[PDB]
Every structure is written in structure tokens, then in C-alpha cells.
Amino acid sequence: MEVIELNKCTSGQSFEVILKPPSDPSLEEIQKKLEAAEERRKYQEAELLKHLAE
């Protein structure tokens, strides 16, 4: 029904039609996370090399 916000130009036009009305982590926190996962890859790898050493 009600057309509003009609704006026209050479490339086209835009409008709005209403029918009814209504009724982050820090840089250090990130790099601690990444490094906390790196140390665990190294622990797992260490226990592997230890196991292979036995």
C-alpha cells in the first residue's frame, strides 16, 4: 500500500513498501590460545619420541 523513501537516479531507483505496521577477544587472548595448542602438539610429539626411544 504505502510507498515511501522513493529515490531515483540514472542507474535505477529504490523505495520501500509497507503493508502493515508492527504490533571480542584481545590479540594476546588469541595468541595464548594458539600457543596453548602448539605446546600440546609438542607434548604429544614428545611422548611419541619418548615412546619410540623406549
Binding site: 523513501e5 529515490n7 535505477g12 594458539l34 595448542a37
Partner: protein
């Protein structure tokens, strides 16, 4: 004028990026060597297409884009592609070994070794911006890179570009076009980590794109090339307002304003029509009413679901071609009398319409036929939560047996992050429900 930087992550992101920038060039009359005879302001400008292109004194128009992949084979085809001259070497970043469809490997292991490099190369573009709006990030949910490294990148961009918006074009996993099994893990994991770092995300289910290519383009078995050229048309429709003159969705901030009331619920459903085969000899051109009515057929949606059994929070209609406001209102009036369109009580039942008189440009020798008028509807409906339900169910089936989990744990990730991510998705599904019923 405010600039926009496009980031393509992983195989899917890169190859879709190619399809999009290919199309952009054809629309803006830019040539493979980066020349644009239309532009008279040599070496710079304040135009709308400059949102996606910067200019060199030599008259070359280069995409404000960066391609990143942890394995070089896909981006290598860009380096030696038809649009090789278009890009700058530093815009194309390649690793040595991919993430092997492992989120943890892309995020933690390999991601840590390349994240600083990528941000540096992104900063080189941001420095050439007088007023950077934000970023458009293309990636897959399924890939280890597309999921893993993207979530890490999205986190860092929220630290190094706090005030800037970030939009997503995400490829939702489909077994039809996937040799991977762990995709449900990667999707839940990257959604969880990225959710509060993304202002508006457009999901595309390969399932939907696949069947559209079979049903409407008569392609027996769609390749990625078929899928991407169709996807690029949708993306073009969504970004056209950022690259052309207009008053609807002129910046990234307006996408959040017009489509996303609630921050977490920022996954608008896209619906596109008409999709017509170029090999179709005789074709009766469709009217505004016919193509608009097609925006409410599930068979045309980027994600298969049933909006009838949900509630709308917003709805934008983006036309390209021979369209006038008159025929649109006439179409809307008719469609509502015959279709189920429920808006949440705290929203107005209406449509924000945008029209661009230039019809949809088609890739020469492509699968799509040229049409006199086309439309892309962006409706934020709670019905898209069906895609989360499917995904989360697949997740629960595998994780109950801890299947494949050892691959992730072996890369430094905690088994707890699985349950954390799944809890977030459970909350999200319930948020959709509170709004939806």
C-alpha cells in the same frame, strides 16, 4: 566513497572469487588487462565501482581483493588464468600443505604460521583506502582452510579493524559435491568461533545450487564451474548496490541495518530468479510478477527450507533489468494474497526494493541465458534454521562415538571445543525458535 576489500579463503572461496571478479569486470566493462575505457578519471576516482577496484597511474583497475589458500594448486590457476594481469602477486598468498579437511589444522597448526603474513598483505590494501568500510569474506564451511583459517582471520580482523564491518559468503556442505565426511565438524566449529565476528553471512547450500543447475540449466552433473558461475550471479546481485549508483544498501553497515535486527541471527536467505538455460532454444521472457512470485518457491532458494513455517524479520528485493516500482507493488500485492508471509510482531510487514535498470550480465559461452529482468530476494527468515538442524544432527551422530575426533586433538585442539561449539549452536537453534514460533 568508501572502499571494500574482498577476502577469498580456501579452494571454494578462491574459485568463487574468480567467478565473481570475472563477472564484475564484464559488468563494469573492465578488460582482462585491467583497462576500463569508460573511466575517464585516470589514475584514481571517486566513483562507485572504485569500491571494489583501485586504479594505477598506468590506467589499470585492480581488484581490492586478496586470495589465500594453504595449498597452491587452485590459486596457481589464478596466477596463470585469463585475469592474471588483473591481480597483483602480493594479493595471491599460497601455502605448501593444505589443512586436509581438518579445522584444527587450518586454525591452529598451519594457521599460526601464515596469519601474520595475510594480515600484512591485507594491511597493504587498507593503506590504499581513504575510508575502508570492511571486508567480504568468501569461504567454505567444509574445508580445513575455509573453516579453520577463516575463523582465525575473522578473529584478528575484529582486533585490527574493530570499527569495520565483516560480511560472509559461506558454502554450506552438501554430500552430492563432497568427498569429505568430517564437514559437519568443521562447519559447527567455524560457525561457533566466527559467529560474533560476522555482521551478516550469506549461506549457500551446494545442494540447492546443484539441483538448480540440474532442474533449470539441464546440466546432468554440475561441475564446480557450473555452480560458481551461478553463485557469482547471486553474489553480484547482492554487491551490485556497493558498485553502482543507488540509495539501498550503499554500505556494509546498511546490510546489518536492513537485514539483521538481532546480531546472532545474521543469516539472510537468498532466493534468485529466473535461472534459464542458454541452450534453451525458445524462451518466453518472464514478467516482474512471475519472477517475484518465484522468490517464494523453495526450489529457487540458496538453501532449501520452508519459510511458510517460520517468521520474517526483514526482506529486500533486488531487481536487475526492465523493472519499475509500479509493477513491483502490483506483484507484491497479488503474491501476499496467495502466499504465507508472517512477520514477527515487532517488525513492519514490508519490502525494501532496489532496482538497477541494467539487466543481469552473463558470462559469454556460459550456461545462463540473458534475461530482460531478474531478481534476488534477501529475506531473514527463521526457516533457515533448518540448515542448522540438519548440520547439528549429523554432528551429534558422529561425535557421540567421537569419530574422527582424534584428527583434531592431534593438532592441538581440545575435545572440549567440540562440545563448546555444539552448545553455541544449540543456543542459536533455540534463539531462532523463540523468534520463529
Amino acid at each position: 566513497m568508501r572502499e571494500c576489500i574482498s577476502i577469498h579463503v580456501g579452494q571454494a572461496g578462491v574459485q568463487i572469487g574468480n567467478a565473481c571478479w570475472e563477472l564484475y569486470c564484464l559488468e563494469h566493462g573492465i578488460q582482462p588487462d585491467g583497462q576500463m575505457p569508460s573511466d575517464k578519471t585516470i589514475g584514481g576516482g571517486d566513483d562507485s565501482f572504485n569500491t571494489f577496484f583501485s586504479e594505477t597511474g598506468a590506467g589499470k583497475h585492480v581488484p581490492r581483493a586478496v586470495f589465500v589458500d594453504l595449498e597452491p594448486t587452485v590459486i596457481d590457476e589464478v596466477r596463470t588464468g585469463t585475469y592474471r594481469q588483473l591481480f597483483h602477486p602480493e594479493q595471491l598468498i599460497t601455502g605448501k600443505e593444505d589443512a586436509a579437511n581438518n579445522y584444527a589444522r587450518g586454525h591452529y597448526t598451519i594457521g599460526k604460521e601464515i596469519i601474520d603474513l595475510v594480515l600484512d598483505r591485507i594491511r597493504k590494501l587498507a593503506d590504499q583506502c581513504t575510508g575502508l568500510q570492511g571486508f567480504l569474506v568468501f569461504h567454505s564451511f567444509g574445508g580445513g582452510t575455509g573453516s579453520g583459517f577463516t575463523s582465525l582471520l575473522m578473529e584478528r580482523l575484529s582486533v585490527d579493524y574493530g570499527k569495520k564491518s565483516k560480511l560472509e559468503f559461506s558454502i554450506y556442505p552438501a554430500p552430492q559435491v563432497s568427498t569429505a565426511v568430517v564437514e559437519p565438524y568443521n562447519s559447527i566449529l567455524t560457525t561457533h568461533t566466527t559467529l560474533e565476528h560476522s555482521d551478516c553471512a550469506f549461506m549457500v547450500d551446494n545442494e540447492a545450487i546443484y539441483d538448480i543447475c540440474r532442474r533449470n540449466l539441464d546440466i546432468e552433473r554440475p561441475t564446480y564451474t557450473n555452480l560458481n558461475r551461478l553463485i557469482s550471479q547471486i553474489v553480484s546481485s547482492i554487491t551490485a548496490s556497493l558498485r553502482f549508483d543507488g540509495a539501498l544498501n550503499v554500505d556494509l553497515t546498511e546490510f546489518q541495518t536492513n537485514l539483521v535486527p538481532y546480531p546472532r541471527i545474521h543469516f539472510p536467505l537468498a532466493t534468485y530468479a529466473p535461472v534459464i538455460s542458454a541452450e534453451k532454444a525458445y524462451h518466453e521472457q518472464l514478467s516482474v510478477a512471475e519472477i517475484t512470485n518465484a522468490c517464494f518457491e523453495p526450489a529457487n532458494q540458496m538453501v532449501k527450507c520452508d519459510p511458510r513455517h517460520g517468521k520474517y524479520m526483514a526482506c529486500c528485493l533486488l531487481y536487475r533489468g526492465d523493472v519499475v516500482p509500479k509493477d513491483v507493488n502490483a506483484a507484491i500485492a497479488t503474491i501476499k494474497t496467495k502466499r504465507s508471509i508472517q512477520f514477527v510482531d515487532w517488525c513492519p510487514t514490508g519490502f525494501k526494493v532496489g532496482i538497477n535498470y541494467q539487466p543481469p550480465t552473463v558470462v559469454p559461452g556460459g550456461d545462463l541465458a540473458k534475461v530482460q529482468r531478474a531478481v534476488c530476494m534477501l529475506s531473514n527468515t527463521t526457516a533457515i534454521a533448518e540448515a542448522w538442524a540438519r548440520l547439528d544432527h549429523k554432528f551429534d551422530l558422529m561425535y557421540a562415538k567421537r569419530a574422527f575426533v582424534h584428527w583434531y586433538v592431534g593438532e592441538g585442539m581440545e575435545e572440549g571445543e567440540f562440545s563448546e561449539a555444539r552448545e553455541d549452536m544449540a543456543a542459536l537453534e533455540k534463539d531462532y525458535e523463540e523468534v520463529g514460533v
